[PDB]
Design a protein around this ligand. Structure first.
Ligand SMILES: NC(=O)c1cn([C@@H]2O[C@H](CO)[C@@H](O)[C@H]2O)c2ncnc(N)c12
Ligand SMILES: [Zn+2]
Ligand SMILES: [Zn+2]
Lengths: 301, 114
């Protein structure tokens, strides 16, 4: 409906403004499946549509861009999402990925382990997460806000996302976190984006566009997730792979966005406005250094 | 002593073994240069583009790379595979060689000997 030719559908603003109660997610198209181009994996199609949507936002795209991708491994031991991200991002972008389980990747560096073990000296311009535990899909128990890797993600954003940077964090009906929604009010703009190839699922990507480092809006995350589910429950999305067949404008434009190092007292309203427009990144421009904490144990005799 | 993984896969394939799967095929225009190994997908009409790591025998089998450096020619790049051979990208990359002047696969694009 125009929508079928888009990469997906973003949560309309009026739904964000409601005060709904959380209900069960019952999708009309549950069990439908889009018809993927021959030989193309779901995860390639899904990340392609995600990136096609991010192309429509005011992402900061500096030289020497730094992107980190959590949850990047597959049961097949490869990283399809990382491969799409590297295709999308400007050549030379520094791309780090990670997963609990071993996998081989096109990223510049890969860390294997629980995300909680991941540390980085530097700040990042874009954080992508597909971390997910299918055990959360338990319709027999109450659907409360989840902690686990979401607690890590919230802290990682607040500590290591550059001002001006953006995030896309995968959620579902049961895999979500109230503080992560609250943190969306710390970006100049935010949404929940559903890919058209996977519209039969309660999955979405929670996107925070241009990080401001402080609340612009106070969001109640329990209410916002209820709002998200209400939207999904009342707005069936037609499964579609149409956008996959036109890749001519896929690459992220290298905007050469300015990078400055500034201290808290220096972030005035003119800076805040530049940040909000995708025109500035604030972080150190030092070398990128990462590590994974390793627990040591000796269980001999 | 050193395992010869390349020969093993070649013999496994000749024995009738099923080719390595789950190579990561990319969406692209299929209007690219057609060169063999590129920083971004460059398949032409006759090719598919794949994420390089997933097509590297050494990456995929968790074995040292056949290079004193151990550098991976494919990881972090994209490999173009003729569509007729895209059922076995790992085999193709092993059994074939890239023209060092024009960047095409010898016998699947390289017109240098003309
Ligand atoms: N707490 C969790 O459940 C996690 C699930 N994944 C990965 O998320 C990906 C998508 O499910 C899988 O490849 C998982 O290995 C994770 N990766 C890193 N850290 C974690 N704490 C998890
Ligand atoms: Zn390799
Ligand atoms: Zn040649």
């Amino acid at each position: 409906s125009s929508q079928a030719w888009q990469p997906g559908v973003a949560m309309p603003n009026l739904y964000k403004m409601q005060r709904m109660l959380l209900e069960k997610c019952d999708l009309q198209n549950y069990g439908d499946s889009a018809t993927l181009p021959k030989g193309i994996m779901m995860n390639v199609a899904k990340y392609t549509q995600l990136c096609q949507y991010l192309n429509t936002l005011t992402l900061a795209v500096p030289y020497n861009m730094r992107v980190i991708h959590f949850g990047a491994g597959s049961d097949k031991g490869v990283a399809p999402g990382t491969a799409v991200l590297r295709q999308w991002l400007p050549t030379g972008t520094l791309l780090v990925d990670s997963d609990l389980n071993d996998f081989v990747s096109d990223a510049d560096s890969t860390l294997i382990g629980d995300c909680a073990t991941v540390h980085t000296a530097n700040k990042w311009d874009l954080i992508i997460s597909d971390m997910y535990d299918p055990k959360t899909k338990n319709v027999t128990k109450e659907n409360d806000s989840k902690e686990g890797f979401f607690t890590y993600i919230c802290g990682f954003i607040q500590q290591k996302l550059a001002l001006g940077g953006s995030v896309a964090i995968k959620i579902t009906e049961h895999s979500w976190n109230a503080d992560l929604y609250k943190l969306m009010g710390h970006f100049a703009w935010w949404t929940a984006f559903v890919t058209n190839v996977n519209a039969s699922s309660s999955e979405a990507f929670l996107i925070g566009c241009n990080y401001l480092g402080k609340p612009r809006e106070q969001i109640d995350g329990y209410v916002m997730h209820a709002n998200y589910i209400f939207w999904r429950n009342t707005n069936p999305i037609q499964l579609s792979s149409y956008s996959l067949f036109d890749m001519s404008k896929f690459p992220l434009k290298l905007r050469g966005t300015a990078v400055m190092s500034l201290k808290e007292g220096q972030i005035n309203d003119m800076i805040l406005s530049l940040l909000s427009k995708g025109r500035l990144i604030i972080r150190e421009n030092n070398r990128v250094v990462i590590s994974s904490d390793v627990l040591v144990n000796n269980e001999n005799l | 002593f050193a395992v010869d993984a390349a020969k093993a896969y070649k013999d496994y394939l000749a024995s009738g073994g099923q080719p390595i799967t789950n190579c990561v095929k990319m969406l692209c225009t299929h209007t690219g240069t057609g060169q063999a190994i590129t920083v971004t997908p460059e398949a032409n009409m006759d090719q598919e583009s794949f994420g390089g790591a997933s097509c590297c025998l050494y990456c995929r089998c968790h074995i040292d790379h056949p290079n004193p450096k151990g550098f991976c020619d494919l990881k972090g790049k994209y490999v173009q595979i003729p569509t007729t051979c895209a059922n076995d990208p790992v085999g193709f990359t092993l059994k074939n060689t890239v023209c060092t002047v024009c960047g095409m696969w010898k016998g699947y694009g390289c017109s240098c000997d003309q």
